[PDB]
Amino acid sequence: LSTAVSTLLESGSLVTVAEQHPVTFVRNFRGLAELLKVSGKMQKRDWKTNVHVIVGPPGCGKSKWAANFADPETTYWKPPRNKWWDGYHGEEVVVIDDFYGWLPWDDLLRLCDRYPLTVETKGGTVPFLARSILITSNQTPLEWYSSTAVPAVEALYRRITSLVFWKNATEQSTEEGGQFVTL
Amino acid sequence: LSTAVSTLLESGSLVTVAEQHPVTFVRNFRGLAELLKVSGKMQKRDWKTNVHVIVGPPGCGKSKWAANFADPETTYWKPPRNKWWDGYHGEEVVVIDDFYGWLPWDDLLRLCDRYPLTVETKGGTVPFLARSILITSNQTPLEWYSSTAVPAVEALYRRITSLVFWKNATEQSTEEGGQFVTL
Amino acid sequence: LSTAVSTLLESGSLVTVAEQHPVTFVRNFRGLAELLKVSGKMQKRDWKTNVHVIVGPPGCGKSKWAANFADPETTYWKPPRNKWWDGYHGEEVVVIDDFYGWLPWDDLLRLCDRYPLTVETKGGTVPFLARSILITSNQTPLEWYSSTAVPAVEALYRRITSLVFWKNATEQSTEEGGQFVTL
Amino acid sequence: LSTAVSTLLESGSLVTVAEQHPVTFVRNFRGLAELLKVSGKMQKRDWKTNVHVIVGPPGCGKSKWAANFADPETTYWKPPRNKWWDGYHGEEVVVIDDFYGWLPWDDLLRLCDRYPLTVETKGGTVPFLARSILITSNQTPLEWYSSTAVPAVEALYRRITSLVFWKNATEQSTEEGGQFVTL
Amino acid sequence: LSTAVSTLLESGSLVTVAEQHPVTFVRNFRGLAELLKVSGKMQKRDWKTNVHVIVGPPGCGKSKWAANFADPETTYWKPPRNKWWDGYHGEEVVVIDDFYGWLPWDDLLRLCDRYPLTVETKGGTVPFLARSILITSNQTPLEWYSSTAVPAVEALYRRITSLVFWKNATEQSTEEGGQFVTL
Amino acid sequence: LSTAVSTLLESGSLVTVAEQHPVTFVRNFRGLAELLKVSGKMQKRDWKTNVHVIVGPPGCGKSKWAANFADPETTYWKPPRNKWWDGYHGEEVVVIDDFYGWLPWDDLLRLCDRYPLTVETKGGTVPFLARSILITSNQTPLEWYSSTAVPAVEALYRRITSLVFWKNATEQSTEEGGQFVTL
DNA sequence: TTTTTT
Ligand SMILES: Nc1ncnc2c1ncn2[C@@H]1O[C@H](COP(=O)(O)OP(=O)(O)O)[C@@H](O)[C@H]1O
Ligand SMILES: Nc1ncnc2c1ncn2[C@@H]1O[C@H](COP(=O)(O)OP(=O)(O)O)[C@@H](O)[C@H]1O
Ligand SMILES: Nc1ncnc2c1ncn2[C@@H]1O[C@H](COP(=O)(O)OP(=O)(O)O)[C@@H](O)[C@H]1O
Ligand SMILES: Nc1ncnc2c1ncn2[C@@H]1O[C@H](COP(=O)(O)OP(=O)(O)O)[C@@H](O)[C@H]1O
Ligand SMILES: [Mg+2]
Ligand SMILES: [Mg+2]
Ligand SMILES: [Mg+2]
Ligand SMILES: [Mg+2]
């Protein structure tokens, strides 16, 4: 356990302690996470996270493309209508699926901002090291959060990387331009 | 417990650990489960979950067909009226009984899909992997939800794999999908 | 403990362990309940919970008969009006007392079915295993729930086993479902 | 520990253990609680709880009589306008202070009844074991509740054991039977 | 921790246990809370609370004399317009600031009585043991509540131990208390 | 160990405890947190909070000026149009944006006073320690309320420190404050 | 954490 802290407080936690020291992590699993969170070494983030937004009527393979995006080993699916990010003890595809506006708008913005973040799970907090958020929906992206219920709708628009609509029941087409309020 | 951790590392199932070495699994059960979560060898889902829907007036014998279907030992009779799936911890009949829509719409769509999902318990989250869901009702699925308060109701009918009915005081005659609505 | 776990895995009931060696159940009590949940030997229900309904104006001795139906060591008196089956860790008799309709309709339909059920306790889940639900009321089962606001009022009546009624200020006489809407 | 388990399982609730071997109750406290709840010997109430109402205009030394009815070690003064019984853990005499009608009717009946009951606390449940409910009030029991919203007001008066009143005299005089409805 | 228990059962305050024993409170911090809560001996109010109503038009240092009452540290400041006494943790001075009547009339009649009470906090209840309730206001105690809405009605104007007005922009003159209804 | 408490009682911060002695912070972390939360008095406030009102015609670069008052990383941007200061931890710029009269009058008068206050989130309370409140509005502070509904009625302007205005497309001019009702 | 709380 003396060596356990030494390995823990280098980088890349807790995945590498659990890989390297399996026995000592069966015990103290709450405490290693608390020590790491207390110190300023939770592997923070400085990269603008990519946001891909998909729109199309159901049955048009919205989520199929999200599944076929990166390796399934390194993919997380946000369970909807639930503000708990349990299961994020790996990382870095995050596919919030089948959206209808069920997240607090400010937090949704915070996930799409550039600053570091720490989401909360059942039994502590976990750093949010995302690189591509595939926000998959079925409706127009504007309607998710009403303009009266939001201080500024354009703030959400600013951090979108790319957007995809659906064509006349044949093709997935990429939306390019200012058909709606652009960024 | 080093043997127990190694025999968890490759098998990746707490059920096996509890079968082999109960004593260690009794003393440190949060630790083993969290180690399994962090090491990434969890059990995601990549298969379509069949949704057999039974409809009939009460007393006709809907639920006895669910209670005899797969095995008395591998069916999880879902606790009703609430979003808690406690005690589930693996496997693969999930029988939501006596349903009339008392589950959130988006979550009911998400239970009946091919892509992964973590489901919520009193203490944390247990991954969802169901090879077949049996839904028992008194109304037809056309009126489980408000057809106006739901954006696109075709996205539920598209997931049901078989809609079994009750005919005029004779038997449970399986209906054929795609006739009255999609299936 | 090494023997206590052995008893637990094959008795299938934490009550047994709690009575044999309490001292090794005072410690490691979460562990045993989680081994029992994982191993699958947690006890389900597959029998029919025969439901007795008692009616009569107040003070006529409804509750006394309910306390004289089984040993007080086993009768679990349901807490009123608040849908929390706390204090239940089993055994046969359940006396929901002084009933007037303070339970959701589907829960009253589903307690009395023959198939497994899990009830909520205050921060957990308890499996339901009763063999007799003595409902005690001042009103006939008609006046528990309004007919219009109920999918089918005949569903509850099918599950009532016996109906004892107080008449003519002498003594309560068992009914046979003739005058009442029969079962 | 087996001494603590002796004093617990043989007879009583956690209070007796707390009074006998505190150093064995600062440790193992959650597990003694679960052993008690699973053993089944958690003290029910099988007796009749006397109900002494006190009526008098504000300032007549109403509550002085209640605080002098029994030793302050065994008086639980219920907080007002709540359904919560927090902190109770068994306190023989229960003085509902200045009670103008802020408790549900059937719940007030069940407190004054003579058969088991488990009252609710913030995040748990506690078995009711009172023996003398002193209902200090301002009006006669005929003004606590209205006959419109009540099945039958006699159903409460049947349980008021004694009834002290204040009239135009410095003494408090008991009520011999009922000039109003009989108790 | 033998000394810690004997010190806790006498002083009845966890803060004292921590200060007189840091090391053995870092471990067994939950157990000491449960031992205190179950054993009894919790410090309950058995004295009279000394109400000091401070009244005058705004800007005259109503709050200045409120915080002047020693100490600046041991003075709970009641949250405005609210029900929950959150975080109170045991003080001796309670300064309800800038009152209008927001606390229910009966709750204010009960805060100033001479008997134990249990206030509500968001997640539990905390015993209320206060020796002076500085009710800063802007009106006299006559017009805090409507003349007819109060049913008692002379039960607040009994317990007002002190009173201070503010005269014509000169100084805070202690009201003699005789002109109004007596205190 | 023992020296952890020695280094905690002379720091007042857990961060240094983790830095110098992490090995005994991986264990016992819950108890150091409770010890700090129970031995150190909650942080009150005694400092007049500056209230810089920003007013102008809509869209005049008000929000950028608001963020430019101090560091955005320690700036709140209170969720508008409700009464839940979702913690935010104490963050000592407070920018209430687009205020147009929706907080209660006395609550706003209290938020800008020299004496402690505790705003409430959902499921708890957070101490309110703000060195600056930035009320960004649309129209004059006298139109936020009418003098009929507000029986103070000029008590807010004492609390306003300064005023920032936008003249006819020149700049965000800082108000004299000497023409209108004084500051 | 869930419960409570909203
Ligand atoms: N192995 C497979 N075989 C056949 N079809 C597949 C397979 N995997 C994915 N699909 C198709 O992917 C589509 C996913 O679309 P959909 O279920 O509408 O997404 P969502 O429900 O998230 O909007 C389905 O129409 C399904 O037919
Ligand atoms: N002991 C028995 N004897 C005869 N029939 C029975 C018995 N137990 C159950 N049944 C039948 O089994 C069927 C299924 O029971 P149940 O699942 O409670 O009804 P439902 O199908 O309406 O949910 C009912 O139609 C009932 O008549
Ligand atoms: N041990 C006993 N000895 C004598 N009489 C008893 C005993 N237990 C109960 N009783 C009688 O039984 C009756 C039960 O009353 P109660 O439970 O209020 O009826 P209900 O709950 O049906 O209205 C009481 O009136 C009481 O006189
Ligand atoms: N410990 C005590 N010492 C002195 N007097 C007391 C004590 N306890 C109660 N009293 C007296 O009892 C009376 C109780 O009055 P109060 O509680 O206001 O009315 P009620 O009891 O009708 O609510 C007071 O006038 C007080 O003088
Ligand atoms: Mg979808
Ligand atoms: Mg059924
Ligand atoms: Mg009864
Ligand atoms: Mg009183």
Numbering used by the authors:
A (entry chain A), B (entry chain B), C (entry chain C), D (entry chain D), E (entry chain E), F (entry chain F): 119 to 301
Anything the authors wrote about it?
To understand the architecture of Reps from CRESS-DNA viruses and how they interact with dsDNA and ssDNA to unwind dsDNA, we determined the structure of PCV2b Rep bound to ssDNA and dsDNA using cryo-electron microscopy (cryo-EM) to 3.8-Å and 4.4-Å resolution, respectively. The docking reveled that the density could accommodate only ssDNA. The 3′-to-5′ orientation refined to a cross correlation (CC) of 0.64 with a Clashscore of 0.0, and the 5′-to-3′ orientation refined to a CC of 0.5 with a Clashscore of 4.4. The better quality of fit for the 3′-to-5′ orientation independently agrees with the biochemical data demonstrating Rep to exhibit 3′-to-5′ helicase activity. The backbone phosphates from four consecutive nucleotides interact with the six subunits of Rep (1 nt subunit−1). Density for the ssDNA extends toward the center of the OD ring and terminates near the guanidium group of Arg148, suggesting that ssDNA is translocated through the pore. Subunits A (top of staircase) and F (bottom of staircase) make limited interactions with ssDNA, whereas subunits B through E more intimately engage ssDNA. In total, there are seven direct interactions between Rep and ADP in the AB interface, three in the BC interface, two in the CD and DE interface, and no nucleotide present in the EF or FA interfaces.
The replicase (Rep) from these viruses is responsible for initiating rolling circle replication (RCR) of their genomes. Rep is a multifunctional enzyme responsible for nicking and ligating ssDNA and unwinding double-stranded DNA (dsDNA). At the Rep N terminus is an endonuclease domain (ED) that is responsible for ssDNA nicking and ligation, in the center of Rep is an oligomerization domain (OD) responsible for hexamerization, and at the C terminus is an ATPase domain (AD) responsible for ssDNA/dsDNA interaction and translocation. The structures demonstrate Rep to be a member of the superfamily 3 (SF3) of ATPases Associated with diverse cellular Activities (AAA+) superfamily clade 4.
